[PDB]
Amino acid sequence: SEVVSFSFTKFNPNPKDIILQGDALVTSKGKLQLTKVKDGKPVDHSLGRALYAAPIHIWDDSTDRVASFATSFSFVVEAPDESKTADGIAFFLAPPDTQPQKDGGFLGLFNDIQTVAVEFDTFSNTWDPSARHIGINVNSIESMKYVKWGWENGKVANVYISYEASTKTLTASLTYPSNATSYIVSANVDLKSALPEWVRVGFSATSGLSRDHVETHDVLDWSFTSTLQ
Amino acid sequence: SEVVSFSFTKFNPNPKDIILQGDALVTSKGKLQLTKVKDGKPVDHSLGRALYAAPIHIWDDSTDRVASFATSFSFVVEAPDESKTADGIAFFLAPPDTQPQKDGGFLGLFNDIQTVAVEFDTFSNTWDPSARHIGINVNSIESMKYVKWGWENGKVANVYISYEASTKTLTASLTYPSNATSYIVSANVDLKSALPEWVRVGFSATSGLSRDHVETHDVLDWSFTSTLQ
Amino acid sequence: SEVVSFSFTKFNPNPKDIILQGDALVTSKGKLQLTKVKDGKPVDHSLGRALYAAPIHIWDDSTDRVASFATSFSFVVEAPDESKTADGIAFFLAPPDTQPQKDGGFLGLFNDIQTVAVEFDTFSNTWDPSARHIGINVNSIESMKYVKWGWENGKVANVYISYEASTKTLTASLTYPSNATSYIVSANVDLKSALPEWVRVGFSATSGLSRDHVETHDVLDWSFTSTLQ
Amino acid sequence: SEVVSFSFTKFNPNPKDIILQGDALVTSKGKLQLTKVKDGKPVDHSLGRALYAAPIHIWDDSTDRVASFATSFSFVVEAPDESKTADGIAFFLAPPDTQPQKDGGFLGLFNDIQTVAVEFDTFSNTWDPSARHIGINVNSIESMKYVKWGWENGKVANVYISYEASTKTLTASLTYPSNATSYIVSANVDLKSALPEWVRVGFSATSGLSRDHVETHDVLDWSFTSTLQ
Ligand SMILES: CC(=O)N[C@@H]1[C@@H](O)[C@@H](O)[C@@H](CO)O[C@@H]1O
Ligand SMILES: CC(=O)N[C@@H]1[C@@H](O)[C@@H](O)[C@@H](CO)O[C@@H]1O
Ligand SMILES: CC(=O)N[C@@H]1[C@@H](O)[C@@H](O)[C@@H](CO)O[C@@H]1O
Ligand SMILES: CC(=O)N[C@@H]1[C@@H](O)[C@@H](O)[C@@H](CO)O[C@@H]1O
Ligand SMILES: [Ca+2]
Ligand SMILES: [Ca+2]
Ligand SMILES: [Ca+2]
Ligand SMILES: [Ca+2]
Ligand SMILES: [Mn+2]
Ligand SMILES: [Mn+2]
Ligand SMILES: [Mn+2]
Ligand SMILES: [Mn+2]
Q: What is the CATH number of the domain that holds B74?
């Protein structure tokens, strides 16, 4: 069996165990700023991602086993205007050599691709439900399951995600401690059919393709563990 | 700082680190059977509880600190008839010398008392919402917050509960892996005002006070951790 | 499988997860003071012990399994005179209802009894090697294996103890960080034959039976984990 | 603070979280075979290394903090002849882009270089003590501290290594469970002066430069954790 875990209570400004992609950087104060901010204001057309350095072994063809994992993190999405926001932030798993894919509504994750994501989606695209939502996405920008999400501007959101290999159940929840409000969604997801044996895990985010649809996507901490047995 | 954690993938038939109260017992196969079963059928008027042996330090008056904790477990509630069920199962915290309190709708936890509970309530009492529900209860059988719960007869439910001391946020969720359906509720709870400095943690359950309102309340596993710093 | 672990970076002055026996107490500053101190000076004829509250499951007759465990702690033994010292401090495992046994050279552990101990023995009794020593003791005050120990008056000692069930190997080591000096001893120990299925773990210590053979026995921290599978 | 840990109870034959260097490979049965074996016999002039994929943050110049870490593993060194053996196996820390250095007595680690190692040295070079030894090495093939080591041909050795940042104490021990025999050495080591802020950790080994001084260097498992706070 092979267990792997890590925790950051904040991020190091030059983080060698984190692969930063696109616009992503860590601030002096240790926030993982996925999308660009200039003079303290979020900018449009931005895409950033961050992956943990070590690959994770999520299934093994030889032994026919699948990993179980769990992760928590908290994040903030702040927009200068509440009524126009885009595009969102996601936690994801993809092949180890994964690179940024399409910006805007594609969240840096998908395009016209093996990636499973839990998305916190702030803009209704042609493929989306009408309301902001938390979605579970398997190799598509279209979610197989979602829950309507009452996004709170600038408030810290706490997230817990777990995957139980014995039942193929992926569950994601979000809670705003400021008003004790929570949301949850689950799905049956076969990681062996969706992903390769080894993946990297992390975050992706994009700001809108227009000046009036901008927001930040900052991650404040992160813990992860996975066991393959 | 003082960290305490434990995990059981199943329970030992004579469990010395578990204080069994009322009707509670562990089966030969390692299930924690909180309420009585006779010839394989659940019996009425039953009350059982189970506490971890070691007290947990949840706050300290001298240093003014409060613990954060998290717990997962899975459980089954099976009734011979889906339309009449009672009374439910709870995870709870109470003083270390806690003893069983009122049966039936009081869940073994409350009466006409310092106890904080997350309840999985299968019968609408005079104090309850109309539907089955998951409730967060602070020193009362009346929940301060609840979510409507679509109870699935005989299916395994997975539970995750966390408490973040820095925000006083208690969150509880339930997922049925069989159909990837989930529920979540949160509340702001001040553990210093509700509970003493040291508590014991565990489970309580009760079957109905009538022959036609019976069900099992079995816990299949359990993991817990708490940190005070 | 059933995992249990705990860590204290210091001890609480009124510790509910620690069963204090004999003279043992926790100081205002959070040291576990096993033997008596009066006006800051150690007193003779003292015996103190401390056990973690939860029993540990070290073997199971039904499944024929044995636990593996590991523990670290640091401690200080300070004597007003380096040349006359007694009697020592031990880490031990015993039945859950274990009570203090003979004082002086018997270390609170043995007498004229199921207890396995790793002893840090500061006085040569009729049954001891000539020099101060670290011993592994199985149901006897006579050690089955020992290593000569250059005790450093008043210096912090770091201890690591592990037990590998697959090989029945118990190993104990001590290091003084002040001068990077270390000692180690191991033994083959069958826990099933020496101990019952469930035990409590902790510390015992005794000061000499004469006024000129006194010392402190203080534990500064402690971490423990055990897994039965 | 930032915690990182991993455990392997055996190694995967194509291990993506392990960077294999030189001759190192993982066998079908999951052993990490650092030096070459042909027809089941060890070959001369071999050098292999293995590093965990994620860099470890061992100190931070900005916050002036240093990590504490601990690691266990077990290994086998088997020679066809007990009286002529070379060269040995080591656990080490080096910059993330570390590459194999000199073969033979240099253990793949050093040359005519920032690397700190705990070495299990089976051949007395001009720079070595006369007997086989366990050494602590800071930027040199010459050990600053060592203990004489009674190497047991083909027996499993269990190793525990810890580093306490608060005292700068590095300690390494080895135990053979087959005959309950153990060895320990410690040293004061300043990781900030010896190493860069970020390192990779792992193993290196070399077989002798002559046909009559060959042995295997196989690692059977591995666990590691480090915390920077
Ligand atoms: C297809 C696509 O990326 N569409 C984007 C959408 O995601 C959002 O960024 C919007 C903001 O005005 O701009 C475009 O419509
Ligand atoms: C007050 C109280 O415990 N009421 C109980 C209720 O909880 C449930 O057990 C019911 C089943 O017929 O019987 C009584 O009404
Ligand atoms: C048998 C026994 O406990 N002997 C004790 C010995 O352990 C030590 O305390 C000594 C100090 O003067 O006093 C007695 O000899
Ligand atoms: C300097 C150097 O690597 N010396 C090596 C020594 O380490 C060992 O491999 C020996 C075996 O015959 O061969 C050479 O002497
Ligand atoms: Ca969208
Ligand atoms: Ca009710
Ligand atoms: Ca003695
Ligand atoms: Ca050598
Ligand atoms: Mn969407
Ligand atoms: Mn209710
Ligand atoms: Mn002795
Ligand atoms: Mn050497």
A: 2.60.120.200
